[PDB]
C-alpha cells in the first residue's frame, strides 16, 4: 500500500460520493 495516486479516478470518486 501507498497513498493513492492522484490519477486513481476510482479513489477520487469513492471520496466524492462518500458519506462519513
Amino acid at each position, epitope marked *: 500500500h501507498s497513498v493513492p495516486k492522484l*490519477s486513481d*479516478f476510482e479513489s*477520487e470518486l*469513492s471520496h*466524492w460520493f*462518500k*458519506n462519513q
Partner: antibody
Amino acid sequence: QVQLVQSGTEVRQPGASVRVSCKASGYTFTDSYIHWVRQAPGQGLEWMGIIKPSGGNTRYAQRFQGRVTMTRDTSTSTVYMELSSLRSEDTAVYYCARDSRGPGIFWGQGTLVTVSS
Amino acid sequence: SVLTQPPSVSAAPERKVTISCSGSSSNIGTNFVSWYQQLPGTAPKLLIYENNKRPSGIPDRFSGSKSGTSATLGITGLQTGDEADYYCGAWDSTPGTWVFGGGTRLTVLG
C-alpha cells in the same frame, strides 16, 4: 442558463459503433463531472459511466466496460460517448447529466439509439 | 449491484407518501443517495441529492432520508401531478459504479 444539448437519433447494425455528443453550456466545463445514463424502452435507468472534463479520466460500469469509451473536447465543451460491438440490448435513450453528487440537476434531451439488422 | 425499491406505491391526495430504497453497506451505507422523478414521456429530474438536499425549483413537499442501508423519499401534499416513476441512486464502492433503483410507480387515489 446551463444547457446540455445532445446529438440526434442513430440507427446502427449489430456489431457497429455509435458516437453520441453532449455539448454543455452556461458553466465552466471543467468544474463538474459528467455522467452518462441509459434507459431502455419500457425499462429503468442504467448508469453507463462518468468522465472528468479536466484530464479526461473515465470510470465505466462492468456491463459496458467492454463496449464504451468516453472523451472530451475542452475547447468546444463537449463530451463524447462511443459504444461499440453494438447489440440489440443497446437500443435505448442515452442521456448525459452534470454531476450533483451523482447524476444531477442538468440533463440532456436524450438520444435514441436503435440497434437493428 | 442494484438498490431495491417497491414496484408500486398507491396513496391518497393531500397525504404523505413514502418510497423506500434498500441497499447494502457499500452503496447506501457508505455513499450519498439521490432521488429522481420521471414523469411520463420526460427525462429524469433530480428531486433530492446528498440524502436530503433539494435542488432549486423543487418544492419543499419532497423530502429525503437515509439510515444505515435504507433511503426514503417523502412527498407531502400529494397531488395528481406527482404521479410519475420515482428512482433512487447511490454509489457502490465495491465495483466503483453508480447504481440505480428499479423504479417505483406512484399512483394517486381518488
